[PDB]
């Protein structure tokens, strides 16, 4: 992970520009719904402008900062990978269900996760990663004891530390845990990604049992899916009320979004409040709304 000089940031901006131009293509018919890459990249630029302006006379400080060096490398990588996607996919980028178009939607989500992370570590343009407040007290002491005040750790280090408190049963389960928590897809775990993961899969005391029941063995769960993709996916079940899927909210990171088909032909999405996801799924089953995960006749039991 290299040192960041102003000249590098101007180089990401030129590429981010290149992506915007590609994504302004009328053939894509991109909707405005979150995550919206034509807003996310201008807003990332603007927040990078803000960080830079708070470190006039202190660039040597900013460029040595580890989180920021990793962030900018991943931003170069992701931007370049988006430009390559357009090059290699060509007219398949405009075919609604094509794999290349799906890859663009997942990148759109990753760009959204990167911005939220960048704003959580640099609110107001100054680094505050070493004072980041983890949300679950439980989870908070785990990170302090293992990593002190570090903002970002390599996946391997995170994995080994977690294993000592919450044993991971296998290599394959470890790589599925990775795919879940590593929202920015950069093989590091930030304290912000750790806060998100432990909010979603609380209580910490049964962390990995929760994540196994809700994501690993649950056909309802949908990794890296957007609001629109959830609506389109449930469309094939419009005539099967009680069909439902659930995922991470893009705009409210740390909270769950449940999509379901109603008896009167609506596809609605809801974010549960003052109620863990477990309980909302159990009650939804009892009350008739959440019956058929991904349209399947059989529903996990969560008692």
């Amino acid at each position: 992970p290299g040192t960041v000089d102003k000249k590098m940031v101007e180089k990401c901006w030129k590429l981010m520009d290149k992506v915007v131009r590609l994504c302004q293509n009328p053939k894509l018919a991109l909707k405005n719904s979150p995550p919206y890459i034509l807003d996310l990249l201008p807003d990332t630029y603007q927040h990078l402008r803000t960080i830079l302006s708070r470190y006039e006379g202190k660039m040597e400080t900013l460029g040595e900062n580890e989180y920021f060096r990793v962030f900018m490398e991943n931003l170069m990588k992701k931007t370049k990978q988006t430009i390559s996607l357009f090059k290699e996919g060509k007219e398949r980028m405009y075919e609604e269900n094509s794999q290349p178009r799906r890859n663009l939607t997942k990148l759109s989500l990753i760009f959204s996760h990167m911005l939220a992370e960048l704003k959580g570590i640099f609110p107001s343009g100054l680094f505050q990663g070493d004072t980041f407040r983890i949300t679950k007290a439980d989870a908070a002491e785990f990170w302090r004891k293992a990593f002190g005040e570090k903002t970002i750790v390599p996946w391997k280090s995170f994995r080994q530390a977690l294993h000592e408190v919450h044993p991971i049963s296998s290599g394959l389960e470890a790589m599925a845990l990775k795919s879940t928590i590593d929202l920015t897809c950069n093989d590091y775990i930030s304290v912000f990604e750790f806060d998100i993961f432990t909010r979603l899969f609380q209580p910490w005391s049964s962390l990995l049992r929760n994540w196994n029941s809700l994501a690993v063995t649950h056909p309802g769960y949908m990794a890296f899916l957007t609001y629109d993709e959830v609506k389109a996916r449930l469309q094939k079940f419009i005539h099967k009320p009680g069909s439902y899927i659930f995922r991470l909210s893009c705009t409210r990171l740390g909270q769950w979004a449940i999509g379901y088909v109603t008896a009167d032909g609506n596809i609605l999405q809801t974010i549960p409040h003052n109620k863990p996801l477990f309980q909302a799924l159990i009650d939804g089953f009892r009350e008739g709304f959440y019956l058929f995960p991904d349209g399947r006749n059989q529903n996990p039991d969560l008692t």
């Binding site: 909210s249 979004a257 379901y260 999405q269 809801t270 549960p272 909302a280 939804g284 009350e287 709304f289």
Partner: peptide, 6 residues
């Protein structure tokens, strides 16, 4: 748009 839980 997110709506209230059922």
């Amino acid at each position: 748009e997110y709506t209230e839980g059922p």
